[PDB]
Amino acid sequence: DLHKAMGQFFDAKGNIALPPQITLAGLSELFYQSDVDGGDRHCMRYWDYSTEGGVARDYNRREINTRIKSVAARLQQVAQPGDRVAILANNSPEYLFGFIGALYAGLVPVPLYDPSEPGHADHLTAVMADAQPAIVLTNNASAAAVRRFFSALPGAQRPRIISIDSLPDTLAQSYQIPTPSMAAAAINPVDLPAFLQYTSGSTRTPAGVVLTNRSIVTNVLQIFAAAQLKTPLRLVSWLPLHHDMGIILAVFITLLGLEFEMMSPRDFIQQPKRWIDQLDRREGDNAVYAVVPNFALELAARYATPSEGLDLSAVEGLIIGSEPVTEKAVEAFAETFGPYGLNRQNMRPSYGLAEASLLVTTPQTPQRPVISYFDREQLAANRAVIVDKGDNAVALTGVGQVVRPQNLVIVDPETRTEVADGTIGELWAHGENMAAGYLDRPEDTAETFHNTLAGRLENSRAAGVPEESTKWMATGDLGVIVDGELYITGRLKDLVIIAGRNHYPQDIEYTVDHASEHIRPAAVAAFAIEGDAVEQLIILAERDLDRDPSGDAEAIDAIRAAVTEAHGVVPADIRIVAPDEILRSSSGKIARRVNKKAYQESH
């Protein structure tokens, strides 16, 4: 019984109490051992699309557990609890067996990517120099790429490379449960590092978010209690496992023994119908869940055209997040798939970040998905005033409520004081899901994780937190709470501020998209760069798939006029490029800061 199992850690007041000895792996094994009679239950289906039709690999409860313990036992022949180990593989069952197997051995995994995928050499080099793992877990498909990545080092300095699907299951029988130290010094197991999450999309040197057993276990409990899950369920995901959103979701589902169906982002992008087909109702189905970034809604709405017989009525939650969720994308999806059983009320925009482990807010009322319209001028002055659709209005999507126990406060970053609901500020979070810091980065850790709330409102969203706490996490994200609902406006650092007015890229990007059918839907990056004595607005946009460069001139003129009229700024530059030329993350989403850097290095 899952719901009781997860409730054992809550108290009457809704507070979480974790025993000092609990770890992520200990929780996983506790649930597995309680799942008497569950060993033969189907738990994971992996789609290999080396061929176009694809071949499924299936694993039941027992097989997953055995693979995990085989990995752990092998690690215990060559390493100690606390050692770091990089995971360098494509999305695959081995990726998960390696990550969780490291946890079982008390090692600290570092989820990374297949190094043969382009665009990671600098990143991987920096991560390896930062975390310095002596061991790499990989699979047979990726092992050559891994061996080559390290071929410029002295052989004696290369990490040991372990290919998980070369390990026999006879290893599992020698796995040993790590025992806690008795010392004096001793950090409790629950407070030890669980894994290191290096995020992507930034041009700066990678920083390792240190997630502890406490961090993750707390967020797993917060997620479970807030998501109002219908069990049993299956979760469909193609998210990259080296992304915060991908790996925690897969681990959440695996630790609870629920059903998980996985492919790689490239499989979705090349044939989005594969994803819609996976959400289609199957005979055994009870509840189906999915988690995607915003752009995927537009891609599927256009390119996963539905057939007679498609039945999406089993989809109980379509979580959308990791980037601004747009009205345009939500409605295109709802309109395309609503006639085939997709309940619009089950679209659930949500917000989080690695520094909070995974999830900060998600809809916890029936009022979702929320779309609200705000006066653009007031918004540019940090005030949210609800207006009627389509009269100088900015459409923003509600991402729900904080997942307790946890506080979410809107804070003036200049004065570090709470602001009233309806006032735009920086989101600050407080709770035991927060990460411990950035690995070996004391000042960056202090800036992001060790903030003090200098002042609060009479009715404070910080209620329950000691007034002197120095543990507020400043997200770097701007937003506002209106009528109890959180809205994300943009990243603080990437605000477009021109002549004393704040402009939000997502707002500008809608104007650009809407300004001409020459532009590929949702394929716009708007950002500011420093000019002579002011900030310049730069706009990059791909022309749609069927369009010729001869239409660029017209689209540019139309984009310029539309943006000037709606926002009162004449773009300094409007560049139109070919489809897929705008740089994107491994998940497929536009990587704005990476594009901005590339533009500056071309001037």
List contacts with ligand ANP (CB under 6 A): 199-202, 244, 321-325, 349, 351-354, 399, 475, 477, 488, 491
Ramachandran class of 465: left when φ > 0, alpha when ψ lies in -120 to 50, beta otherwise: beta
**Whole-number Å distance between alpha carbons of 548 and 82:** 56
Binding part of the chain for ligand MYR, among 100-108, 142-150, 297-305, 352-360 by CB under 6 A, reads: 352-360
| Out of 32, 46, 260, 289, the residue judged to bind ligand MYR by CB under 6 A | 289
Ramachandran class of 132: left when φ > 0, alpha when ψ lies in -120 to 50, beta otherwise: left
Binding of residue 591 to ligand MYR (CB under 6 A): no
Binding part of the chain for ligand MYR, among 22-30, 223-231, 369-377, 524-532 by CB under 6 A, reads: 223-231
Dihedral sign computed on CA atoms, order 338, 343, 349, 355: negative
Binding of residue 244 to ligand MYR (CB under 6 A): yes
Rank residues 163 and 222 by Cβ distance to ligand ANP and give the closer one.
222
Other Cβ atoms within 10 Å of 188 Cβ, number: 17
CA atoms within 13 A on the CB side of 199: 20
Out of ligand MYR, ligand ANP, none, what residue 312 binds, judged by CB under 5 to 8 A for its kind, is none
Smallest separation, CB 321 to ligand MYR (Å): 3
Binding of residue 201 to ligand MYR (CB under 6 A): no
Binding of residue 265 to ligand MYR (CB under 6 A): no
Out of ligand ANP, ligand MYR, none, what residue 162 binds, judged by CB under 5 to 8 A for its kind, is none
Beta-bridged to residue 56, according to DSSP, are 47
How many Å from the N-terminal Cα to the C-terminal Cα in the chain? Answer: 60
Query: Which residue do the tokens 């602001």 mark?
Result: 419
| Out of 136, 319, 435, 559, the residue judged to bind ligand MYR by CB under 6 A | 319
Smallest separation, CB 221 to ligand MYR (Å): 12
Closest CA to 426 of 382, 468, 470: 382
Size of the site for ligand MYR (CB under 6 A): 18
Binding of residue 300 to ligand MYR (CB under 6 A): no
In contact, 193 and 81? CB cutoff 8 Å: no
Rank residues 171 and 227 by Cβ distance to ligand MYR and give the closer one.
227
In contact, 469 and 442? CB cutoff 8 Å: no
Residue 428's H or E segment, with its range, is strand 425-430
In 3-state terms, what secondary structure has residue 595?
A: helix
| Out of 91, 254, 322, 475, the residue judged to bind ligand MYR by CB under 6 A | 322
Other Cβ atoms within 10 Å of 115 Cβ, number: 23
Q: 355 to 394, contacts with ligand MYR by CB under 6 A?
A: 358-359
Rank residues 131 and 209 by Cβ distance to ligand MYR and give the closer one.
209
**Whole-number Å distance between alpha carbons of 406 and 428:** 11
Rank residues 9 and 195 by Cβ distance to ligand ANP and give the closer one.
195
Binding of residue 477 to ligand MYR (CB under 6 A): no
Name the residues that contact ligand MYR, by CB under 6 A. Answer: 223, 227, 229, 235, 244-245, 289, 291, 317, 319, 321-322, 350, 352-354, 358-359
